[PDB]
Design a protein around this nucleic acid. Structure first.
Lengths: 99, 200, 57, 79, 93
RNA sequence: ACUCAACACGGGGAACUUUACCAGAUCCGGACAGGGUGAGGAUUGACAGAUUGAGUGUUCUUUCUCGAUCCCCUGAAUGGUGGUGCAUGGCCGCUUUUGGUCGGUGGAGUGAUUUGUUUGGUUGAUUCCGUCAACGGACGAGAUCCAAGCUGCCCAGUAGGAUUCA
RNA sequence: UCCUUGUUUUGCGCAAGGUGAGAUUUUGGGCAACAGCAGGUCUGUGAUGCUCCUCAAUGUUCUGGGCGACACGCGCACUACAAUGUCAGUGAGAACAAGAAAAACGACUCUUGUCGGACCUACUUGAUCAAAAGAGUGGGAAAACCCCGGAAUCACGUAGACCCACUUGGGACCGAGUAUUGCAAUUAUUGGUCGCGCAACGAGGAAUGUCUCGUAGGCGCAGCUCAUCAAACUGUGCCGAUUACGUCC
């Protein structure tokens, strides 16, 4: 492995606060940053009939979720990673998968 | 993953539900769920705190416990909070609760309806509506509606200015619908769907 | 041993479209879902999101 | 759907219900005591216990014509 | 069905018990930290009776049950376990 | 469920389950004890044989094994894909994809009413313009939203090229 | 927007051309007022009023057996496959598509509070002799594995067979053998090879369905349901036209 921080979320304008600002700490602030960035957004798509009984003209609804995914890289910091990560914990339903 | 999301989703559903139902007449409105790593912070947003929190904290600690046994948290990985959301008029859910309570206690139709619509439009709401269906007069149901101010009903901009709520009132000789709408003076941040404006 | 061994057995084996039962109610008719391992269509999905789903299109 | 009300083909001996079959003063029928010799009372048993951990306490076996039995661990030492 | 005593000791020092609605047995705290194991139906029966006696306050949501137990509950229990208390919530805070 | 808004529809492609329906057997999931049960109590489970579709203690014979809430009797409670969709909520379909709906102030009439919302042109559109006792608003239309085509900034050790040397 | 200074009233706009990735609701969706129907649903729900039933039950019954949208002269609805020589049919060789799908279930071994396996698929073997099957090893929690996703329609200067016939066109029915799925495949469950084809059917009456451009039509794949089985439904891609752009009969 290397140090790979991934960020996943259910909406945009959530990810951007975490990534695109508040990984500031590793950016130009103290140490090197190699920044790759963002990945295929996936769609989770659940088609569902609209009538609670059997009648009608056979209408439907389609519902959707969006996933959002991000990814950034650091070249062996030796427990500066503690600092860098911990400052943004922010926004409900953003999760942070550090490797 | 695809899965982590759905976990958070189904969680948030069940959570919401159990509070909405079993905690009544406090003007329950919303929650929020979030995590900081290795904690869970769930706030609760209801008009009247002194009922929520209990006399010395019995009620809040109660809820805590309930949750922990279901979703299999340890203590100190779950903590709950209360908040007053003041300006009661500008929540659908709040006024839906209140209106329900009165109809269950054998108040009329039009009297009860009006009383809501007052308190709403005094809070500064752009317009509101209220509906009641079900029994009234006797036989063949009936539906009636009461309207004040103005509101939009199309687009996706009535899904960001108008949040609604629907509840039941269980009575003898019929169930009875009730519903309350309420268009806000504000968005969820800011946005106006039309209305071009010239700033000199 | 006797009657107890012969009562409630063949679907604590778990098989077929029996022993499903939705999370939201307990109804097992009208399809529990296997699609991304959610359950909602038995309390209908028109009634409940709060999962993050919306019709955009 | 639809429904009706009537069940009776019937008119057999139906089952009796199982009901406890009582033994009275069960301990004294097992433990046997004797004429007193040397001022010491000699206690014997007509019931011998089963050798399994579950039955290892005080729990006795049984006695039928053609078999011996243990109601605790459901076992047979056959006669 | 004498897991009674265990169940009642899970009550006292919590004030709350929860169980799924299911006919197949499972432990009704999912962890108690005393690691008891009880069926499902047995549990359900216990709290049912005490409910009718006014000692319980019942809540159902989804496919589950949330059990809170009153001021009244505390009385009944203390007499059955032959023990005084300062009170259930004061110990917890 | 029965014209259009029944008839590859009830997410209904069901071996058992699912399942309502048929033949047969089982279990209390009858809470709450006011009314009855000594140390045995009232009570639970069962090998073997027999009954039986059943090496199913269902039940009996037999004996052993166990909380005394379990057990016995009335009241009551409960559960139900039982009835009623012409008791009812919610949701959906349809009327109706058509451009429609309503009030205020002013004007005209003693008023039932009308003007605004009209003859004309124009537009998918009560969409606009012209004439004009009307003016200014609110819903529907329009707009806001989602996807597709082109493009800027961003980006690569999960995208893919160029050159050199062997 | 621009221009034709055409057309129009200077107006609202309209037609043709130009500019351009795109030219007129740019293209396809979602949303959608007021007033209603005695439309459907009590078989979606701890959504329910009043009634019915309640210990030899209309409850529970994941209990054993049968029945279910399945049982057979016959009418009707929707679907799929054909009557072949415009790829047309069995054989061969060449190129070639994108949305999407998979991960956790108290047992296990790990220490002191947690690893691995129940899901996909590759390679190799089996194969010193059919398919279907079998077995061992490895990767992937998904833009990493599968995957350079070698789809089918299609193409051929492949000297390929076939020849107008109900024929090698179509198969419906029908017998035998075998393996897998599952606790249980008997009323054949699903594959997979032999025989049955000499069973229909040779472009289809009255009448009738919905469509204006990447559309109609042809063709294939995935998701859905889910031990097993899709002629269905939902979604994505490939090959890709004819006619009209009008009227009120």
């Amino acid at each position: 492995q290397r140090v790979l921080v991934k960020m996943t979320s259910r909406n945009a304008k959530a990810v951007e606060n975490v990534m695109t600002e508040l990984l500031l700490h590793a950016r130009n602030e103290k140490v090197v940053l190699r920044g790759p960035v963002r990945l295929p957004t996936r769609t989770l798509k659940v088609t569902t009939r609209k009538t609670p009984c059997g009648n009608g003209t056979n209408t439907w609804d389609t519902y959707e979720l969006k996933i959002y995914k991000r990814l950034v890289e650091l070249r062996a910091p030796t427990e500066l990673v503690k600092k860098i990560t911990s400052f943004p914990i922010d926004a409900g339903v953003d999760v942070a998968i550090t490797i | 993953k695809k899965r982590m999301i759905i976990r958070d989703g189904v969680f948030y559903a069940e959570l919401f539900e159990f509070l909405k139902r079993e905690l009544a007449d406090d003007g329950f409105a919303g929650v929020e769920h979030r995590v900081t790593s290795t904690r869970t912070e769930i706030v609760i947003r209801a008009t009247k705190t002194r009922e929520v929190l209990g006399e010395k904290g019995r009620r809040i600690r109660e809820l805590t416990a309930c949750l922990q046994q279901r979703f299999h948290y340890k203590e100190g990985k779950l903590q709950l909070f209360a908040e007053r959301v003041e300006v009661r008029g500008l929540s659908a859910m709040a006024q839906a609760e209140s209106l329900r309570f009165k109809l269950l206690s054998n108040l009329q139709v039009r009297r009860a309806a009006m009383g809501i619509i007052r308190h709403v439009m005094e809070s500064g709401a752009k317009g509101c509506e209220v509906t009641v269906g079900g029994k009234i007069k006797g036989q063949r149901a009936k539906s009636m509606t009461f309207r004040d101010g103005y509101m939009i009903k199309s687009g996706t901009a009535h899904k960001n200015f108008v949040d609604v709520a629907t509840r039941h009132c269980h009575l003898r000789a019929g169930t009875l619908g009730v519903k309350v709408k309420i268009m806000l003076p504000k968005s969820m941040q800011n946005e106006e769907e039309i209305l071009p404006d010239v700033i000199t | 041993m006797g009657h107890l061994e012969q009562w409630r057995s063949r679907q604590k084996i778990g098989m077929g479209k029996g022993s499903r039962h939705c999370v939201i109610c307990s109804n097992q008719k009208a399809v529990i879902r296997k699609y991304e391992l959610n359950v909602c269509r038995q309390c209908f999905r028109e009634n409940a999101a709060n999962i993050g789903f919306s019709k955009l299109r | 759907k639809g429904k009706k009300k009537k069940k009776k083909v019937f008119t057999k001996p139906k089952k009796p219900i199982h009901r406890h079959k009582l033994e009275k003063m069960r301990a004294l029928k097992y433990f046997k005591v004797t004429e007193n010799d040397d001022g010491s009372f000699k206690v014997e048993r007509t019931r011998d216990e089963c050798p399994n951990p579950v039955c290892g306490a005080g729990v006795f076996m049984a006695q039928h014509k053609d078999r011996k039995y243990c109601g605790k661990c459901h076992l047979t030492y056959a006669a | 069905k004498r897991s009674r005593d265990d169940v009642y000791r899970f009550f006292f020092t919590e004030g709350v018990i929860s169980c799924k609605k299911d006919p197949l047995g499972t432990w009704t705290g999912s962890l108690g930290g005393k690691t008891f194991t009880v069926p499902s139906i047995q549990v359900m029966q216990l709290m049912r009776s005490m409910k009718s006696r006014g000692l319980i306050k019942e809540q159902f949501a989804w496919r589950h049950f949330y059990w809170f137990l009153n001021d009244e509950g505390v009385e009944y229990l203390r007499k059955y376990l032959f023990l005084p208390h300062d009170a259930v919530p004061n110990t917890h805070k």
